[PDB]
Amino acid sequence: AHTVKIYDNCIGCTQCVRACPLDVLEMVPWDGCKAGQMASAPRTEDCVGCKRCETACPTDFLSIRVYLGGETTRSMGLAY
Amino acid sequence: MLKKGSLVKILRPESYWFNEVGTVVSVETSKVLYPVLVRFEKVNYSGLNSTSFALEELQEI
Amino acid sequence: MNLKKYLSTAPVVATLWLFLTAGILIELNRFYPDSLFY
Amino acid sequence: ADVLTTCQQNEAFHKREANEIRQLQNRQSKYDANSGGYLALQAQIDQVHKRFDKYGELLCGQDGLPHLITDGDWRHAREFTIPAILFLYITGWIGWVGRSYLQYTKQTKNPTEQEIILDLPMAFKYMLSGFLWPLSAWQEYRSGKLLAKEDEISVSPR
Amino acid sequence: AALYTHHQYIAGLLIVGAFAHGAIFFIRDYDPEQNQDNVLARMLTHKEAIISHLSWVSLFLGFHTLGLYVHNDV
Amino acid sequence: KVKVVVDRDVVATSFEKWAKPGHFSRSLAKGPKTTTWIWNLHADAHDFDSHTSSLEEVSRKIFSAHFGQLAIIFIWLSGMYFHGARFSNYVAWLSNPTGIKPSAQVVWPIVGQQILNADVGGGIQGIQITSGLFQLWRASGIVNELQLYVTAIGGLVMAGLMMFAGWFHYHKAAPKLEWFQNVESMLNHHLAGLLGLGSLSWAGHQIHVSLPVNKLLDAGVAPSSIPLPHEFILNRNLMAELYPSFQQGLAPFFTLNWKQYSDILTFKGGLSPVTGGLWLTDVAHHHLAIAVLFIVAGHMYRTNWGIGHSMKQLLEAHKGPLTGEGHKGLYEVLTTSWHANLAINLAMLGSLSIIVAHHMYSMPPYPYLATDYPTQLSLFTHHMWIGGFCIVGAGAHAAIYMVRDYSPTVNYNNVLDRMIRHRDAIISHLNWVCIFLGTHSFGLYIHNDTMRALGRAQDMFSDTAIQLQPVLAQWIQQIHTLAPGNTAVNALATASYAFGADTVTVGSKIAMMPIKLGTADFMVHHIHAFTIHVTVLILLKGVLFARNSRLIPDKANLGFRFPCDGPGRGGTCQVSAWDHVFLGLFWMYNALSVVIFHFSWKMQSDVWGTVSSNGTVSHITGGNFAQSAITINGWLRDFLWAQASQVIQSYGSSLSAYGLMFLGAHFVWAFSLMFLFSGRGYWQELIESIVWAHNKLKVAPSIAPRALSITQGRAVGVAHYLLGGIATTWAFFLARIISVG
Amino acid sequence: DFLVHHAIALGLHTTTLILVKGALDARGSKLMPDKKDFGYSFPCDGPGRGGTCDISAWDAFYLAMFWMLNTIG
Amino acid sequence: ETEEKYAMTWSSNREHVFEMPTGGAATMNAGDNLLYLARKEQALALATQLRTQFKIQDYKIYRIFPSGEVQYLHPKDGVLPYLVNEGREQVGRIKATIGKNVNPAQVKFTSKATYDR
Ligand code: CLA
Ligand code: CLA
Ligand code: CLA
Ligand code: CLA
Ligand code: CLA
Ligand SMILES: CC1=C(/C=C/C(C)=C/C=C/C(C)=C\C=C\C=C(C)\C=C\C=C(C)\C=C\C2=C(C)C[C@@H](O)CC2(C)C)C(C)(C)C[C@H](O)C1
Ligand SMILES: CC1=C(/C=C/C(C)=C/C=C/C(C)=C/C=C/C=C(C)/C=C/C=C(C)/C=C/C2=C(C)CCCC2(C)C)C(C)(C)CCC1
Ligand SMILES: CC1=C(C/C=C(\C)CCC[C@H](C)CCC[C@H](C)CCCC(C)C)C(=O)c2ccccc2C1=O
Ligand code: SF4
Ligand code: SF4
């Protein structure tokens, strides 16, 4: 599976979660930023590693990071 | 002591603007991890010109 | 004034400057042909 | 030196002159004296003579072609040294006035707009001020205005 | 001809490999903390100076070598 | 129902927006922060349906832009006529068509480039032209420079009028959407008005000007001594001397005694033994027959008077039990999408350019074209390339339709929907056919190379070993040879001497003769079948999977043109429809390169050449095609290596520009590989170090330097690949054929 | 011999440029400041931040091979 | 069958024409709808379409295992993932920024990654 990590500079903009075509990510309550919420990656077993989440992340550098890992039927996006 | 308009030098190495001078837009009063929003003239590789920093990552220039 | 702003656009000034440059070099080679040294 | 001789005294060089005239005359033979074809080919024949006479003073290889010396020897200054100095004067001018204009644009309200839509009066001002660029550049260097400080330039993590 | 060509292609493969393992070294084995302010760390410190000057000499050689050949061809 | 409706003074004529680069785009109007903006400005300038959501505003830009294109074409044509008038040996060439080389470009004496002013004859020195303009102008009856000058001036006036009309129909009188959607009216006018009256009015020129001028030229009258065209119209006795039917006037036309015009309107077939061109009395009659067909055809579609067909009713009627709702929706598709129309129109115009290439070499329509081998080779090759580019474009716009304009509601169980619903069956079968064709076409060459290299000539696919006779093509040649007096009873000769019958010579040079098809011809035809099927695979796959695949289920949302959807799913580089077009271009280049090489070699080997007084044909490459063109080594050695001799030996001659362009084109081709093989990540990182050096000297630009986009890298790559590859062949071909032809 | 030696110098310097840039940017760049976390060889970092094809130090090896072959040529 | 399948259920008031993620026009029933899809991404791509075009919010995506197990996937908590919801525990958080990640040298011949603090 791929590894998806959320770093503390997340501003809780929700753009990564909206961008994810596999529903890997969700917004969770968090006091660390003014938005009152942080990206979370609970379903990385479904992550294809498309990095649409990183493309969407406005922080410099990225608050969400995708480390491509061991390939599976799911991660390779295979319908056979 | 940063406020809206203060000039700050960036100390965050992975920042597009490391060593550059930005302008403080706002300093968040509430206890947040990265409260200082800093704006730059140069856009980064995503075409954005602002991001939030901790006080330790800024030098008032 | 808008036409002058257009004529100040990168490609127009580049075209005109390189035309002028090319003209000078062409005309120097017309009048001083085969200059292999000073 | 047997490898290089003065082109004036080089038989291969004279042979090349003769060959180039002969080829032009072999073409000219198919035209009738007063014709444009004849006069055009005659013009080229006249310039062949003028060229080979001009290059006579150069050193020639055994190929009978002018070979340029670029080692700093003043006897060959006209071949490289003088053209080299002229090149650096012109391009130093281009670079200097370009830097001057670029520095002007960064003081304006929309610096990027002044890079794609030139302030022609300001461009002309800096372009006409390039003629003493080596002194201008020296004065900026001495005054600590030429170079940005290492502190102020963005770099990637090492 | 065979031997000159054979050995220059081997030499070429070897120097590309040398630099490949140089790059791999920097990712996998290089510890900045254990090389603080030494000659190796100082290379990374002015990498932009090194790359920009190699870019300059490459451009210079390319423009003038291609330039002179094309002058000669024309 | 069919009405003219325009909006007046819709756009003010102001330079304001000229001084605002990227005014047309909401994304670009704000101006540059990076160099990417400069490229984007140009990439997006004509993508009108990205600028605005209004189909009306898109339509009006298109109509006005079209006038811009015609204005430019008129400047170019005008140029060709003016260069003919002012800088050409055309007048001299008319008096010695076989001896003088056409020339209409003179270079200035500077840096020694006057070497390119070749000894072409006719009392000038200049570049030998291969456009066939002289043969066109001779067929048109042009005999003097005044006629060419006046055509050039006329061209500039048409260019001016096109510019006025483009300006006028955008700024002053812009037609409404409902004007443009009059497809029935448009087709009636374009069929009857453009093609019908074009052909009728041209037939008029031919009968009144071309025919009499060319009859006198072919008799050997001095072009200066020929009466000016208007004298044939004014003095009917002059015309009656040449074509006696002109005694009876127009009475035989209105009374249906049409056989009286047997002199001016013929069905001779074959070629003039004098000019090696089609009989102009055949061409005049062709154009009359076509004109009638088109004027009749353009009465098909209903406009304002009840009579005529609804194209909507026609499409919806063509419904069978195997194809669901059939052609339901396609009328809506083609009246609401410019891209859908551009897709069809490019496919057909491109395919037409290719048909023109084949018909024009084999039935040489212009006098002294057939034996001007440079022109024959140039015209075939040129029209092949234009055709290839247009067909790939059809793929691009078909796919743009699928991404931007396609709706499931319009295309519900219609032929388009049903195609998408078995795209897997379509692409799997076409994939298979490509592997079958590739193995059994290219494999025969590799088999042959292997057998010849192993000293096994008796084990080869060849005319002298294992024969692959194109028996169906051979059989069709026979039928076309037997046609005149038989299945074409009133035809005196074959449509083309390519099929059989006689060898036509003009002077000593072969105009046309039977093109015999053997094993080498069978093999190269299956290569063409192969390269076309693969190109179709790439472009069709692009269209049918433009909106989604099993890999990218939401591909339509990512758009027509996007680099990838990231390295996940194993890697999704070049999934976009745009990337299929990108790959399609290389295969089109591959396919057409082999077509024009097949043409060049076959014509030189087996057709073009000299016929002696004895009457023995000596071909340019002496029949080496049959035994050399059945191996790749034969193509490398007997074609590229042997025929490149002219271009590489061109230095110090008038053909030296071809030598230079041969190397220049190789350079540009190779340079392309830098863009195609690399990725912008490398380049953006390099630029960072270069930007550092500029920052150090306080000379870094405010418009931040960026590596080209991933897509632009590909666009630059394929553009330089094609420019380099095509220009290389151009220099090769022209140097070769101007020397040996 | 003068001209081709400058061709050889061009090839040595450019091949060196690619390989040295590869080595000195292997750990990270402004475009990918955490590149060392992805290792020597990886496809890219996706189409974000302008696009990142051939950003890995391995990709510099791949590009340098063309220049090495060209130069030895 | 041999591999995992995805069932997508939704309700519609009207018989909307929609685009299958496998290509081509379909008509959803004015009532309950059930599609079987090979990939979670196909189901979500259709769900995006249903939500954006037809304002259908009641879609449910399931994973069918070849064993016969049915796992409800989306929306996991009943609320869409981009709307912050109580009861969701953070997964994948790393403290500080990417800049604080260690060198591969420091983590060589260990289970740890550079981002493992
Ligand atoms: C004022 C403009 C200017 C100045 C002073 C410099 C200066 C420099 N460049 Mg840069 N460069 C420029 C423009 C400029 N450049 C532009 C427009 C480009 C994009 C093509 C580059 C691309 C570039 C690269 C890729 C590299 C350099 C490098 C360098 C450095 C080494 C010398 C060299 O290679 O120059 C020669 C530069 C070139 C051949 C590039 C083109 C130069 C253009 C044509 C000049 C444009 C002039 C401008 C339009 C004038 C307008 C002024 C007017 C409005 C008043 C030196 C700091 C090298 C370096 O980093 O060395 C350490 C290096 O590798 N430059
Ligand atoms: C013939 C093939 C070809 C050519 C000419 C180039 C040229 C270049 N490469 Mg590339 N490269 C190639 C193939 C080629 N490459 C291939 C197949 C690959 C593998 C993917 C690469 C991968 C590669 C990498 C990884 C790098 C290079 C770099 C370079 C630059 C090296 C320095 C130099 O020579 O500057 C002089 C420039 C040239 C010789 C280019 C041509 C300049 C022309 C002649 C000027 C034309 C002006 C003229 C007026 C015409 C204008 C046309 C008009 C339409 C506007 C140079 C731009 C390096 C670089 O950028 O260093 C700074 C670099 O890091 N290349
Ligand atoms: C004569 C004066 C004139 C003026 C002042 C205007 C003014 C305007 N036009 Mg109009 N228009 C005109 C004539 C004029 N037009 C003509 C003759 C036509 C028929 C082609 C049109 C058709 C037209 C269309 C379809 C549109 C406009 C639009 C506009 C607006 C934006 C234009 C812009 O940014 O262009 C600056 C662009 C150029 C200077 C490039 C022009 C390129 C020409 C046509 C072809 C170049 C030849 C060839 C390809 C060159 C190759 C060279 C080589 C180096 C490769 C602006 C209000 C646009 C708009 O959005 O209005 C609301 C719009 O969509 N115009
Ligand atoms: C007889 C009627 C007629 C004719 C001849 C044409 C001809 C043309 N139309 Mg069409 N058009 C017509 C009716 C006609 N249209 C009607 C009724 C509609 C609305 C239903 C349209 C809607 C339409 C659109 C939307 C477009 C066209 C376009 C075109 C051009 C296609 C490109 C081409 O083949 O250039 C061939 C070029 C020539 C033959 C040279 C120019 C010819 C000029 C325009 C005058 C021709 C007619 C005139 C009466 C001739 C007088 C003869 C003289 C001896 C007295 C072509 C000029 C396209 C275009 O390019 O527009 C600019 C385009 O986009 N037309
Ligand atoms: C010489 C260069 C070359 C070759 C051989 C190939 C081969 C192929 N391309 Mg590729 N292509 C190329 C260049 C090439 N391409 C380039 C430069 C590009 C970038 C533009 C592409 C981009 C591209 C695309 C986008 C597509 C292709 C496709 C194809 C396949 C076409 C179907 C086919 O004929 O398969 C059969 C194989 C051949 C004809 C090659 C040789 C066959 C030999 C002679 C016979 C069999 C030999 C035997 C089995 C060997 C046993 C020996 C072993 C035991 C040691 C074929 C595998 C298409 C495809 O996949 O179609 C289904 C496709 O869609 N190519
Ligand atoms: C001024 C200004 C500019 C500033 C550029 C500034 C910073 C340049 C920095 C240079 C660096 C720091 C070291 C330079 C090192 C100089 C080298 C080491 C040259 C050695 C000489 C050789 C060795 C010639 C030998 C020989 C000669 C003697 C005679 C020949 O015949 C034989 C050979 C064998 C060729 C710009 C860029 C903004 C543009 C603007 O436009 C003007
Ligand atoms: C002339 C002469 C002489 C002298 C000489 C000399 C002195 C030489 C030198 C030489 C040299 C001096 C050489 C050099 C070379 C080098 C090289 C070839 C390099 C390489 C490198 C690399 C590849 C690297 C890599 C890496 C990296 C990148 C980083 C990390 C680590 C490493 C290191 C691995 C004599 C007197 C004896 C004799 C006579 C003549
Ligand atoms: C070489 C290369 C580059 C580098 C090339 C770049 C950035 C383009 C070079 C820009 C040229 C030189 C034009 C810039 C000139 C300025 C407009 C200044 C003009 C000055 C006068 C002539 C007027 C990429 O960015 C790239 C991206 C993706 C895949 C492959 C590649 C690739 O192969
Ligand atoms: S896009 Fe980036 S900043 Fe926004 S919620 Fe996701 S990780 Fe946080
Ligand atoms: S290599 Fe380039 S095109 Fe391929 S997935 Fe990565 S970013 Fe996209």
* Residue-wise DSSP of F119-182: EEETTEEEEEP-S-HHHHHHHTT--SHHHHHHHHHHHHHHHHHHHHHHHIIIIIEEEPHHHHT-
Closest CA to H35 of H57, H64, H13: H64
Mutate to test the pocket of ligand 6, among D68, D69, D70, D135 (most ligand atoms within 8 A of CB): D70
Structure tokens at F314: 């026609």
CA dist., res. F417 & res. F397, Å (int): 18
Integer-rounded Cα radius of gyration of chain E: 18
Does residue D71 sit at the G interface (CB-CB below 8 Å)? no
Structure tokens at F602: 């076959």
Does residue H108 sit at the E interface (CB-CB below 8 Å)? yes
User: Which residue does chain G place closest to H99, by CA atoms?
Assistant: G34
Q: Which residue has the tokens 């095509």?
A: F726
Q: Which are the contacts of H115, defined by CB distance < 8 A and separation ≥ 6?
A: A5, A65, A67, G37, H94, H98, H101
CA dist., res. H12 & res. H49, Å (int): 13
Strand blocks (E) in chain G:
none
Burial of E13 (0-12, 13-18, 19+ CB in 10 A): middle
Burial of F258 (0-12, 13-18, 19+ CB in 10 A): exposed
Closest CA to G19 of F708, F710, E64, E26: E26
Look at strands F103-105 and F118-121 and give their pairing: unpaired
The closest residue, in CA terms, to atom 2 on ligand 9 is A57
G34:H103 CB<8 A: no
Q: Could you tell me the resolution of this structure in angstroms?
A: 1.9
| Strand arrangement of the beta sheet that strand H32-37 belongs to | H32-37, H5-11, H60-64, H70-74
Closest CA to F542 of F667, F697, F392: F392
User: Which residue does chain E place closest to H109, by CA atoms?
Assistant: E28
Look at strands H93-94 and A3-7 and give their pairing: parallel
SS (H, E, C) F661-689: HHHHHHHHHHHHHHHHHCCHHHHHHHHHH
- Ligand 1 binding site (Cβ under 6 Å of any ligand atom): D 94-95, 97-99, 101-102, 118, 123, 126-127; E 52-53, 55-56, 59; F 690, 693-694, 697, 699
Residue E42 half-sphere exposure toward CB, CA atoms < 13 A: 3
Give the atom of ligand 10 at the shortest distance from the alpha carbon of F566: 5
E32:H108 CB<8 A: no
Backbone dihedral angles phi then psi of residue F191, each to the nearest 5 degrees: -70, -60
| Strand arrangement of the beta sheet that strand B58-60 belongs to | B50-53, B36-39, B21-27, B7-10, B58-60
Other residues' Cβ atoms within 10 Å of the Cβ of residue F509: 19
Mutate to test the pocket of ligand 2, among E58, E66, E74 (most ligand atoms within 8 A of CB): E58
CA dist., res. F177 & res. F185, Å (int): 14
CA dist., res. A11 & res. F242, Å (int): 91
Asked if F729 contacts F666 with a C-beta cutoff of 8 angstroms, the reply is no
F554:H24 CB<8 A: no
Look at strands B50-53 and B58-60 and give their pairing: unpaired
| Strand arrangement of the beta sheet that strand F509-512 belongs to | F504-506, F509-512, F609-611, F617-619
Widest Cα–Cα separation across chain F: 91
CA angle, corner F53, sides to F48 and F56, nearest 5? Answer: 75
Residues of B in contact with A19 (CB under 8 A): none
| Calculated CA dihedral for residues H78, H82, H83, H86, nearest 10 degrees | 70
3-class secondary-structure state, position G18: helix
* Residue-wise DSSP of F38-69: HHHHHHHTT-HHHH-S-HHHHHHHHHHHHHHH
Structure tokens at D83: 């053209």
E28:H105 CB<8 A: yes
Closest CA to F686 of A38, G21, G59: G21
Give residue numbers after which chain E breaks (C–N above 2.5 Å): none
CA dist., res. F303 & res. F186, Å (int): 10
Residues of B in contact with D155 (CB under 8 A): 18-19
Structure tokens at F644: 């490149």
Please work out whether the CB of residue A10 comes within 6 Å of at least one atom of ligand 9. yes
Other residues' Cβ atoms within 10 Å of the Cβ of residue F406: 23
| Calculated CA dihedral for residues F637, F642, F647, F648, nearest 10 degrees | 70
Integer CA distances (angstroms), F68 to F164, F169, H67, in order: 9, 11, 67
Beta bridge partners of residue A28, listed in sequence order: A38
Closest CA to F699 of D137, B14, G33: D137
CA dist., res. F34 & res. F651, Å (int): 44
Q: What's the first-to-final CA gap in chain C, in angstroms?
A: 45
Helix D120-127 and helix D81-105, axial crossing angle in degrees, nearest 10: 140
CA dist., res. F94 & res. F132, Å (int): 13
SS (H, E, C) F471-521: HHHHHHHHHHHHCECCCECCCCCCCCCCCCCCCEEECCEEEECCCCCCHHH
Please work out whether the CB of residue F108 comes within 6 Å of at least one atom of ligand 3. no
Other residues' Cβ atoms within 10 Å of the Cβ of residue B31: 8
CA dist., res. F71 & res. F59, Å (int): 19
Residues of C in contact with D50 (CB under 8 A): 34
DSSP structure class, residue D117: B
The method recorded for this entry reads cryo-EM
Q: Please tell me the number of the ligand nearest to residue D138's CA.
A: 6
Where b means 16+ CB within 10 Å and e means fewer, A42-67 reads bbbebbbbbbbbbbbbebbbbbbbbb
Other residues' Cβ atoms within 10 Å of the Cβ of residue F671: 15
The closest residue, in CA terms, to atom 1 on ligand 9 is A57
- Left, alpha or beta for F276 (phi > 0: left; psi -120 to 50: alpha)? left
CA dist., res. F19 & res. E71, Å (int): 39
The closest residue, in CA terms, to atom 36 on ligand 6 is D95
Structure tokens at F730: 């151009």
CA dist., res. A18 & res. H81, Å (int): 8
Structure tokens at A55: 């493309």
Please work out whether the CB of residue F613 comes within 6 Å of at least one atom of ligand 3. no
Q: Which are the contacts of H110, defined by CB distance < 8 A and separation ≥ 6?
A: none
CA of A5 to the centre of ligand 9 (A): 11
Q: With residue F202 as reference, give the H or E element that holds it.
A: helix F197-205
Asked if F196 contacts F294 with a C-beta cutoff of 8 angstroms, the reply is yes
Asked if A33 contacts B36 with a C-beta cutoff of 8 angstroms, the reply is no
Residues of D in contact with E32 (CB under 8 A): 158
Closest CA to F120 of F143, F88, F95: F88
Structure tokens at D48: 């062949």
Domain span at residue A6? Answer: 1-80
| Surface of E (36-55) touching G: CB under 8 A | 43-44, 47, 50-51, 54-55
Residue F591 half-sphere exposure toward CB, CA atoms < 13 A: 26
CA dist., res. E36 & res. D5, Å (int): 60
DSSP structure class, residue F459: G
| Calculated CA dihedral for residues F422, F423, F427, F433, nearest 10 degrees | 40
DSSP structure class, residue D33: T
The total number of structural domains in chain A stands at: 1
Look at strands H60-64 and A26-29 and give their pairing: unpaired
Burial of D135 (0-12, 13-18, 19+ CB in 10 A): exposed
Where b means 16+ CB within 10 Å and e means fewer, F486-502 reads eebeebebbbbbbbbbe
Structure tokens at A42: 């609970």
Residue F469 half-sphere exposure toward CB, CA atoms < 13 A: 7
Structure tokens at F733: 């071909």
SS (H, E, C) F385-436: HHHHHHHHHHHHHHHHHHHHHCCCCCCCCCHHHHHHCCHHHHHHHHHHHHHH
CATH code assigned at A12: 3.30.70.20
Please work out whether the CB of residue F166 comes within 6 Å of at least one atom of ligand 3. yes
CA angle, corner G15, sides to G11 and G16, nearest 5? Answer: 115
Beta bridge partners of residue F126, listed in sequence order: F118
Q: Which residue has the tokens 């990656």?
A: A41
Q: Which are the contacts of D7, defined by CB distance < 8 A and separation ≥ 6?
A: D13, D52, D55, D56, D57, D58, D59, D60, D64, D66
Closest CA to F73 of F9, F10, F163, F137: F163
Integer-rounded Cα radius of gyration of chain B: 11
User: Which residue does chain G place closest to H98, by CA atoms?
Assistant: G34
Residues of D in contact with E47 (CB under 8 A): 156, 158
- Left, alpha or beta for F9 (phi > 0: left; psi -120 to 50: alpha)? left
E31:H106 CB<8 A: yes
Q: Which are the contacts of H60, defined by CB distance < 8 A and separation ≥ 6?
A: H8, H9, H10, H72, H74, H75
Structure tokens at F495: 């449509």
Where b means 16+ CB within 10 Å and e means fewer, D77-114 reads bebbbebeeeeeeeeebeebbbbbbbebbeeeeebbbb
Q: With residue F716 as reference, give the H or E element that holds it.
A: helix F710-740
CA dist., res. A40 & res. F143, Å (int): 83
Chains touching A (3+ CB pairs < 8 Å): B, F, G, H
Other residues' Cβ atoms within 10 Å of the Cβ of residue D38: 16
3-class secondary-structure state, position F364: coil
Residues of D in contact with F19 (CB under 8 A): 117
Closest CA to D137 of D106, D86, D82, D91: D91
Asked if H79 contacts A28 with a C-beta cutoff of 8 angstroms, the reply is no
Structure tokens at B28: 């968040």
Where b means 16+ CB within 10 Å and e means fewer, F271-306 reads bbeebbbbbbbbbbbbbbebbeebbebbeebbbeee
Please work out whether the CB of residue F194 comes within 6 Å of at least one atom of ligand 4. yes
B43:F684 CB<8 A: no
The closest residue, in CA terms, to atom 51 on ligand 1 is D98
Asked if F415 contacts F319 with a C-beta cutoff of 8 angstroms, the reply is no
Q: Please tell me the number of the ligand nearest to residue F433's CA.
A: 5
Please work out whether the CB of residue F418 comes within 6 Å of at least one atom of ligand 4. no
What is the distance of C-alpha E27 from the center of its chain? 18
Does residue G46 sit at the A interface (CB-CB below 8 Å)? yes
Q: With residue F367 as reference, give the H or E element that holds it.
A: none
Other residues' Cβ atoms within 10 Å of the Cβ of residue F235: 12
SS (H, E, C) H38-79: CCHHHHHHHHHHHHHHHCCCCCEEEEECCCCCEEEEECCCCC
3-class secondary-structure state, position G3: helix
SS (H, E, C) chain C: CHHHHHHCEHHHHHHHHHHHHHHHHHHHHHHCCCCCCC
The closest residue, in CA terms, to atom 65 on ligand 2 is F674
User: Which residue does chain G place closest to D69, by CA atoms?
Assistant: G2
CA of F435 to the centre of ligand 5 (A): 8
* Residue-wise DSSP of F307-348: -SB-HHHHHHH---TTSTTTTTTHHHHHHH-HHHHHHHHHHH
Beta bridge partners of residue H72, listed in sequence order: H62
Q: Give the amino acid at H72.
A: Y
Q: Which residue has the tokens 């003579």?
A: D49
Whether the bond between E60 and the residue before it is cis, its omega within 30 degrees of 0, is no
SS (H, E, C) F546-577: CCCCCCCCCHHHHCCCCCCCCCCCCCCCCCCH
CA of F67 to the centre of ligand 4 (A): 10
Does residue G52 sit at the E interface (CB-CB below 8 Å)? no
Mutate to test the pocket of ligand 6, among D126, D141, D146 (most ligand atoms within 8 A of CB): D146
Give the atom of ligand 9 at the shortest distance from the alpha carbon of A7: 7
Q: With residue G31 as reference, give the H or E element that holds it.
A: none
SS (H, E, C) chain B: CCCCCCEEEECCCCCCCCCCEEEEEEECCCCCCCCEEEECCCCCCCCCCEEEECHHHEEEC
User: Which residue does chain B place closest to G50, by CA atoms?
Assistant: B45
CA dist., res. F413 & res. H24, Å (int): 8
CA angle, corner F104, sides to F102 and F105, nearest 5? Answer: 125
Residues in chain F: 741
Does residue A23 sit at the H interface (CB-CB below 8 Å)? yes
Q: Give the amino acid at F454.
A: L
Look at strands A64-67 and A3-7 and give their pairing: antiparallel
The closest residue, in CA terms, to atom 41 on ligand 2 is E63
Structure tokens at F482: 């037997």
Closest CA to A71 of A32, A51, A41, A45: A45
Burial of D156 (0-12, 13-18, 19+ CB in 10 A): buried
DSSP structure class, residue D66: B
Are chains B and E touching, using the cut-off of 8 Å on CB pairs and a minimum of 3 such pairs? no
Please give, rounded to a whole number of angstroms, the shortest distance from the CA of E20 to a CA of chain H: 17
Give the atom of ligand 2 at the shortest distance from the alpha carbon of E59: 35
Structure tokens at A25: 């990510």
* Residue-wise DSSP of A13-58: --HHHHH-TT---EEEE-SSSTTSEEEE---GGG-----HHHHH--
Beta bridge partners of residue H46, listed in sequence order: none
Helix F519-544 and helix F577-606, axial crossing angle in degrees, nearest 10: 170
C33:F16 CB<8 A: no
Asked if G24 contacts E50 with a C-beta cutoff of 8 angstroms, the reply is yes
D155:B18 CB<8 A: yes
DSSP structure class, residue E40: H
CA dist., res. F443 & res. F590, Å (int): 17
A42:H96 CB<8 A: no
Does residue E29 sit at the F interface (CB-CB below 8 Å)? no
